[PDB]
From a paper:
Carbamoyltransferases (CTases) catalyze carbamoylation, an important modification for the bioactivity of many secondary metabolites with pharmaceutical applications. GdmN and Asm21 contribute to O-carbamoylation at the C7 (S configuration) of geldanamycin and ansamitocins, respectively. CTases in class III, which modify secondary metabolites, adopt two nucleophilic half-reactions, the formation of carbamoyl-AMP derived from ATP, CP, and Mg2+ and the subsequent transfer of the carbamoyl group from carbamoyl-AMP to the secondary metabolites. GdmN forms a face-to-face homodimer through unusual C-terminal domains, a previously unknown functional form for CTases.
The carbamoyl-AMP portion remained almost in the same position, while the formation of the C-O bond between the carbamoyl group and the oxygen atom of C-7 in 1 drove a slight shift of 1 towards carbamoyl-AMP. The capture of the tetrahedral intermediate implied that this catalytic reaction proceeds in a stepwise manner rather than in a concerted process. Another intermediate was 2, which was carbamoylated, but not cyclized, with AMP located adjacent to 2. In the GdmN/AMP/2 unit, the C-7 oxygen of 2 was 2.9 Å from the lateral chain of H27. The distance between the amine of the carbamoyl group and iron ion was 3.1 Å, while the distance was 2.7 Å in the GdmN/carbamoyl-AMP/1 subunit, representing the end of the carbamoylation reaction. The structural characterization of 2 revealed the conformation of ansamycin derivatives before the formation of the C7,9-cyclic carbinolamide group, which has not been observed in other studies.
Author numbering:
A (entry chain A), B (entry chain B): 1 to 674
């Protein structure tokens, strides 16, 4: 029994179903493969097309999933989609009324077109199953819990009719208990408030991280105007008819001005975040307290995008409402896609289920075999120096104790937003200066941002306060207090309020990552490491070996440990041996506006990526003429000939374009099949 | 007292407040001037910046209005803006939260800045008066009716808080009787339905045009699901949580699918438009039946953009609910901008009321003086031939009876959407072929819509059924039955139901134009002409002299009468003397897209207009090189020399671009200070 789990929109690699399709119209595209109830493969399309939280159809991810499972498309019994058919089709239909050129292709046609043109797979109509959205979330969250009965809570932006559903799960049966309509959405509330801090969709956990720096008292009475707790677990949010945003009109009237990009985070900003955080905590806990005592369950599964609010999860844990809590590593809409497969397998036959609580998120493609990895690292030889230690884990521990910041890339990539020892960046967790530098030099982001620790399972309760319910900590789902006599020891990973979004790694969770953390602690006294996602500010988590090295070279990381190979930057790297390649979304433009006295303006030259919210950059005329000659095979050095050779001026410009990922730079060839 | 009335957004000429600012965000920019209670001058900014229904700050409109009154900016006693401050500032705030790079400038600052920069006008805060939107509409509609008391009804898409408001008006006193909340919007219902017909904002008149071709019984039980008539002149529209459109989800669920660009109108589309129109007729007559009885009033003013529904107005006339009915020539938001002037004067000093009933929309800038116009037509010599008849109206009547189709440009331009004898295209109205001949050829549009008759006040009732109430017909506000006997006589101007959007011209509403239609009737026994707006498919009604000549040369009209001059296109006109200039929104682009095997793809060259819904055209490499060298002074022929001279190929390419108004082409210099 082999079932595919789908979610996302239906856009091709180089265009969107409608021009400039908005970034929130079916986001976080992914594919999941379940076999005999076990999740054997899952990857988000963002990892393969390098567009954070992409809406494009997860074609690549279906191809990679089938590969990991050793299956051909003809082997797939059923395909599940994470939304009912009428609903996605009504929203497609709306987009078409706004774009009269766009042909009327609805989701069934478009799914079948993409699979057949992209994989040579005529999918039979009888094998395509559409699924209620919060039902898909529920299966995902609950089946992987290792629990045979639980209260299941789903909160996200919105399914087809509800912003929240409450379920009773017993064995493999889900039974709806309650639902909350769309205009009461808490993910809608959080995203609306996020826009006031100069952020956008995808940034909600940055706002979460800012919250502890603020005082929730300043704006408590203001947020109080926007919601009302009612009897028997109910609540309302209070809308307006001015703008499609629940928060900004009231705050404007009270003198709050939205932050601008580039501007610092004032104390009123920090307090806004703090009150918003408190608001959602008050509502969800109000919900949960009710349905805890009403349904009689002592175990909770929390899912939906809101369950990535690890601060909220830490409060649920410490509330005494439950004895166990479980959160899926992908509780946002990629997880809903996985659950759509369970639900599809349920409607065509009986539901085979996992036999154990999900402990590892390490479910995407791998980096490659030993010999193809050595072969590809030889292709980067003009740019990198490679050592091959006897015991790479032992070496890396030593380098981490010496204050090196390491890139760490092993095995299959993590499903979901957190990195957990397979696409990580790690450093000594003890020096407070490691927070300030890794924020400013490495990940190149805001100074208030916290960093998450990983601790061995054996030493966890030596450092953190895991008391209360038993939560799963293999995926940094819970914010947890650092024990007060440890907060100075752990300067980098102890947040401003003495909490940390902790990861407890074990031999069973991640044998190798646990070996590294164990040895570091043998060497230093402190079995705890800083562990942040391996990606710069312009890309999702690195996936392939070429992704890893590109990110290593364009980030200020000291050394890279990839599959037992020690990689370091060469002194004088040779950029010219790299082969430029346009992304399907790369565009080159020469533009002239109007000028003085109705003249033509002076030429300018930009490179930009053709999706909603994609970056832009001015380029020099020499670089513009170079990039126009890109054939995907000529190296950068021979391309530069046509503009008088790769000057140092040109290399630096290319390099900065490379950092922002406007086009692929990587040696000739590729690593090959895996 | 001198009061300026403003409406529209705050964008400058070349950019918008936020990038690609939606075309519905405070549209139909305009400026009006009142002095001692009289409307001295009013021009929509669309005529001056040449963008249909523009949202941009009406700076040119204000320069034109001040000069028309012989006034410095400093002379003005108050400025009135057609929306409350906190509402426009809350919408601006919402735009700013979605574009975190936009500086936080709200309306009071933006208004002062556009005036300080654009007119050197240091506007003191004391003088800026924001106005309730539906109050603005009502003042405009009622003070020009020449009525001394009336029931005032405003229906539009929405103001700050309502979509419909009912007023009692006595002299200068406005008293509010009733409101209808935003989600009951009939403008909204209408505009929603228009998107299902392949059309968009500003195409509502076309949907009205199509509805008689259709049978409302088909989709009548369907629309009945979307609304309910309730007691006491109340109605409910029934929404949905699927999409921001009232109509599309339910119609998708029954198999109605929207038409696409360039698709012919099917019988389903025809019937849809018929049921839509019947519905808003039902609801609006249900509102009016109640408020006519409850207020007891015999007179009705009607305003807000829904009042530009000529067919609905005709049902109000033919209902026996009122004696008089009045509709202002600019009942859409440009009229709310004038009414904002009046309300500012009332809030400050006292409100001086306009003398009599408005009879003439001729309120814009004029073409120029006889010496100026003659001189500028001399600059146009390489392209036209000019006769100076002794009696132009006399000659023009002859050609009309001979069968020529005439451009007719006199005096000041009409305020509001209808051309009424000052920027018109006139023709014999008797031959049915004249429909397709003028629509589907010279103006290059669509021919399902009949044309509009202008009849003399004297013969008016010998041709049309003006019975029922006493409506004002000086602005084509009412659709009325064509008398059955004259139906065959008037083939060009009579619909499938026998009705006609009637202009009734009198010696007092417009002298020159009355003489013209009388004389034509003495020469033919039919004192009815066809009257359409002087504009092709890519422009609003022409304004300037150069506007009028440009439009004549890029359409297939036979003759042009402009201020007693008879203008025809030369045998071989010399394009090369024209000086091309960029419009502030013109962009010239060389694009390269992604290509096969990750290469740099296709080098296309494009000209486009940078605004929401602006046209785009591909250009040849030679045009690209030519256009990029436009400097605002050098002629087209001299510019063409840098690419081998103005071939017939290039001149056709350039001409086709001129038809679509990507550029200004006109002789060197201007007409001068008008
Ligand atoms: C993302 O962010 C937001 C999004 C939205 C709202 C908001 C935000 Cl923040 N929030 C806000 O607050 C908006 C603010 O308020 C505003 C822009 C107000 C503008 C000034 C106002 O336009 C007015 N005042 O209605 O203009 P008017 O000329 O008098 O009439 C025009 C009407 O008349 C009908 N109509 C004409 N001709 C005929 C005929 N021949 N037959 C039958 N119907 C006809 C037309 O069909 C049309 O509906 C509102 C309006 O309608 C817009 O649609 C044009 C609404 C569009 C809906 C939205 C933008 C969703
Ligand atoms: C202009 O057209 C619109 C606009 C809007 C709504 C709709 C339509 Cl048509 N109507 C819909 O039905 C949208 C549909 O359901 C979608 C896209 C569901 C996705 C999978 C949601 O993803 C989840 N599961 O959270 C996305 C969100 O909620 C998101 O916040 C991330 C908030 C979005 C608010 C929006 C997009 C306002
Ligand atoms: N850390 C967070 N806190 C609160 N809400 C969040 C958080 N992350 C995502 N969301 C909301 O979850 C919604 C998306 O959920 P989903 O459909 O599962 O992808 C959006 O409304 C997000 O704003
Ligand atoms: Fe969801
Ligand atoms: Fe209006």
């Amino acid at each position: 029994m082999l079932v595919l789990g789908l979610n996302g929109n239906f856009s091709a690699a180089d265009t969107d179903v409608v021009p400039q399709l908005g970034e929130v119209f079916f986001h976080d595209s992914a594919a999941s493969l379940i076999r005999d109830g076990e999740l054997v493969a899952a990857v988000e399309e963002e990892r393969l097309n390098r567009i954070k939280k992409t809406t494009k159809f997860p074609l690549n991810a279906v191809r990679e999933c089938l590969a990991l499972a050793g299956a051909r498309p003809e082997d797939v019994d059923a395909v599940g989609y994470y939304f009912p058919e009428n609903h996605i089709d009504t929203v497609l239909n709306h987009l078409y009324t706004e774009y009269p050129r766009a042909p009327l292709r609805y989701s069934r046609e478009l799914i079948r077109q993409r699979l057949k043109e992209g994989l040579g797979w005529d999918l039979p109509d009888e094998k395509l199953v559409y699924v209620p959205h919060h039902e898909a979330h529920a299966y995902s969250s609950y089946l992987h819990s290792g629990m045979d009965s639980a209260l299941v809570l789903v909160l996200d932006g919105r399914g087809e009719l509800h912003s929240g559903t409450v379920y009773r799960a017993e064995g493999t049966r889900l039974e709806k208990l309650a639902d909350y309509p769309v205009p009461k959405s808490l993910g809608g509330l959080y995203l609306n408030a996020t826009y006031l801090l100069g952020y956008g969709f995808g940034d909600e956990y940055k706002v979460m991280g800012l919250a502890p720096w603020g005082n929730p008292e300043t704006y408590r009475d203001t947020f109080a105007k926007l919601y009302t707790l009612q009897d028997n677990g109910e609540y309302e949010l209070h809308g307006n008819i001015m703008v499609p945003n629940l928060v900004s009109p009231l705050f404007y009237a009270e003198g709050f001005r939205p932050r601008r990009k580039g501007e610092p985070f004032t104390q009123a900003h920090r307090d806004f975040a703090a009150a918003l955080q408190e608001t959602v905590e008050k509502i969800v806990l109000h919900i949960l307290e009710y349905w805890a005592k009403t349904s009689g369950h002592s175990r909770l599964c929390f899912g939906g995008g809101v369950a990535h609010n690890s601060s909220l999860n830490g409060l649920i844990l410490k509330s005494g409402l439950f004895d166990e809590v479980f959160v899926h590593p992908a509780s946002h809409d990629a997880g809903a896609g996985e659950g759509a497969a369970y639900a599809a397998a349920a409607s065509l036959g009986t539901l085979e289920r996992p036999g154990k609580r999900l402990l590892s998120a390490s479910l995407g493609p791998a980096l490659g075999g030993r010999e193809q990895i050595r072969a590809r690292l030889a292709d980067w030889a003009p740019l990198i120096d490679v050592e091959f230690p006897d015991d790479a884990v032992e070496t890396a521990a030593g380098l981490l104790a010496e204050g090196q910041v390491l890139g760490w890339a092993y095995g299959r990539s993590e499903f979901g937003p957190r990195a957990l020892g397979h696409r990580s960046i790690v450093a000594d967790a003890r020096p407070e200066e490691n927070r300030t530098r890794i924020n400013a030099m490495v990940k190149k982001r805001e100074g208030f941002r916290p960093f998450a620790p990983v601790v061995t399972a054996e030493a966890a309760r030596d450092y953190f306060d895991l008391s209360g319910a038993d939560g799963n900590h293999e995926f940094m789902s819970f914010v947890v207090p650092v024990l007060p006599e440890r907060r100075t020891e752990l300067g980098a990973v102890t947040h401003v309020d003495g909490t940390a979004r902790v990861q407890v790694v074990s031999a069973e969770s991640g044998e190798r990552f646990h070996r590294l953390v164990r040895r570091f602690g043998e060497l230093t006294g402190t079995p705890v490491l800083l562990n942040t996602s391996f990606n710069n500010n312009a890309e999702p988590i690195v996936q392939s070996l070429d992704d890893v090295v590109t990110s290593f070279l364009t980030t200020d990381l000291d050394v890279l440990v990839v599959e037992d190979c020690l990689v370091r930057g060469k002194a004088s790297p040779d950029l010219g041996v790299l082969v430029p390649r346009f992304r399907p979304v790369t565009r080159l433009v020469e533009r002239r506006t109007a000028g003085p006295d109705a003249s033509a303006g002076a030429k300018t030259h930009e490179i930009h990526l053709d999706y909603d919210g994609g970056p832009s950059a001015k380029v020099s005329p020499e670089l513009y003429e170079l990039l126009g000659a890109v054939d995907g095979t000529t190296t950068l050095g021979d391309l530069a000939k046509t503009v008088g050779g790769l000057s140092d001026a040109l290399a630096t410009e290319v390099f900065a374009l490379w950092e922002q990922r406007f086009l692929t730079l990587a040696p000739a060839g590729d690593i090959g099949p895996l």
